[PDB]
Antibody
Framework: QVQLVESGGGLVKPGGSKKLSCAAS????????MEWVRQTPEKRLEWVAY????????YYADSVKGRFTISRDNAKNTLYLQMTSLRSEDTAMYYC???????????????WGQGTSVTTSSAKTSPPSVYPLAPVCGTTGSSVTLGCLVKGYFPEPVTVTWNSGSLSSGVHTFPAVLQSDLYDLSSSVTVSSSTWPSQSITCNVAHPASSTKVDKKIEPPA | ELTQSPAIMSAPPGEKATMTCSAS?????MHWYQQKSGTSPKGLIPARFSGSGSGTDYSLTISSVEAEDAATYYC?????????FGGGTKLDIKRAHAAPTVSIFPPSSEQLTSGGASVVCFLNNFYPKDVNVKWKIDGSERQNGVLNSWTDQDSKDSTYSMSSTLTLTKDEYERHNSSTCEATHKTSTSPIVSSFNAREVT
């Protein structure tokens, strides 16, 4: 398989520097021209930088001219991106992509990474408050719905899973909503009525910046 | 400039769907990408997808559309590409109207012993996206102190969801006992309602 992995992202303040990297594997890295593509919260895909098969030619976008500096390391199979004078509008999900189809039509960004969050703000890095959402009754339904409130954190992202990812279908992790320099998110999970409260359920929250791996069990209030 | 034909488009499963990408410069080819809900964009152009374009105007064709194809699509250019992307088209899918499953939750002990008190009301799996919700407390419609968040088209269910969270302090939670979550939708003119009363602890 081919794989691309972005790294070195996080929080930055406006007018600061941050260096990203894209670990490449599964192909002859030195025989391919890499791409950086960022995506906003509004989700507008925007090409930012390009570098040739071996650093012979590089292009940029009007947005990121002069401030951004793309580079690569063919010995270590490692792409790079240096950022210099970051603004609020540079806050984005930074993807790394290859650029090679070569025959019938011509080149194309055929393989992409998993992205990495870069945020530009002078606000405080705050960890999440995980509160369990159990319902007010133990009444009978076809299926029972529970939840997990990821309250007051900054910045994005936060990873929410149920029972270490074993519970997946019938789950709804909602988009975060920023208010007063603080994000709030709340995932929900639906399960059969005979399962809970007889069997245990636990939402697993993880906030990279604070390094807070939390696991809050959902119990009824009697 | 590279421009899309529809900003947003809808089409039911089975039926055909077409969207075009028009540049301001002639090219020998055109590319297409599909980014789904949480995942990254995938290089695209199964037997559903195919490309058709003459000179400048290109277009993506999707016959026998399915729930999976509910995604946002981006076009980039062929021969003469400083590798800019297009405006983007959001393709949602038509579906029979589904009534939302309402579920209200009191604030936990952990939150109550830290000053705050948040009351969540989940409205999962409905159609269309449109949904009005008025938080009530002792029969009084609350306007502010509410932070909503909607999900986008489900990749297999093709249904939207929502989570409305009323946020108050432990002190202001005592003035009023009966907290209520009402919800309006196309399916029933009579609105969906779930409520609970404090001073009645479990």
């Amino acid at each position: 398989q081919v794989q691309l992995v972005e790294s070195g992202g996080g929080l930055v303040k406006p007018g600061g520097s941050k260096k990203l990297s894209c670990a490449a594997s599964g192909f002859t890295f030195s025989s391919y021209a890499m791409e950086w593509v960022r995506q906003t919260p509004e989700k507008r895909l925007e090409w930012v930088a390009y570098i040739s098969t071996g650093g012979g030619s590089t292009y940029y976008a009007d947005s990121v001219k002069g401030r951004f500096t793309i580079s690569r390391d063919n010995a270590k199979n490692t792409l790079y991106l240096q950022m210099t004078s970051l603004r609020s509008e540079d806050t984005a999900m930074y993807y790394c992509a290859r650029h090679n189809y070569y025959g019938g039509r011509i080149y194309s960004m055929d393989y992409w990474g998993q992205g990495t969050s870069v945020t530009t703000s002078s606000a405080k890095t705050s960890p999440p408050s995980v509160y369990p959402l159990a319902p007010v009754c133990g009444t009978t339904g076809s299926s029972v719905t529970l939840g997990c409130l990821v309250k007051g954190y900054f910045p994005e992202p936060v990873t929410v899973t149920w029972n270490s990812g074993s519970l997946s279908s019938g789950v709804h992790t909602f988009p975060a909503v920023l208010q007063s320099d603080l994000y709030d998110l709340s995932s929900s999970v639906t399960v059969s009525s005979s399962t809970w409260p007889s069997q245990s359920i636990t939402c697993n929250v993880a906030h990279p910046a604070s390094s807070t791996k939390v696991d809050k069990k959902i119990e009824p209030p009697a | 400039e590279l421009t899309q034909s529809p900003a947003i488009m809808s089409a039911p499963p089975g039926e055909k769907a077409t969207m075009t990408c028009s540049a301001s410069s002639s090219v020998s080819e055109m590319h297409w990408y599909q980014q789904k809900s949480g995942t990254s964009p995938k290089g695209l152009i199964p037997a559903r997808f195919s490309g058709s374009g003459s000179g400048t105007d290109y277009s993506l064709t999707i016959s026998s559309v399915e729930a999976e194809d509910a995604a946002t699509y981006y076009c980039q250019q062929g021969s003469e590409n400083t590798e800019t992307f297009g405006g983007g088209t959001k393709l949602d899918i038509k579906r029979a109207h589904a009534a939302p499953t309402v579920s209200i939750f009191p604030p936990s002990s952990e939150q109550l012993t830290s000053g705050g008190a948040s009351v969540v009301c989940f409205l999962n799996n409905f159609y269309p996206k449109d949904v009005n919700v008025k938080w009530k407390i002792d029969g009084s419609e609350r306007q502010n102190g509410v932070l909503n968040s909607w999900t986008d088209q489900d990749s297999k269910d093709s249904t939207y969801s929502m989570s409305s969270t009323l946020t108050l302090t432990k002190d202001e939670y005592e003035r009023h006992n009966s907290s209520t979550c009402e919800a309006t939708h196309k399916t029933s003119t009579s609105p969906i309602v779930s409520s609970f009363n404090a001073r009645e602890v479990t």
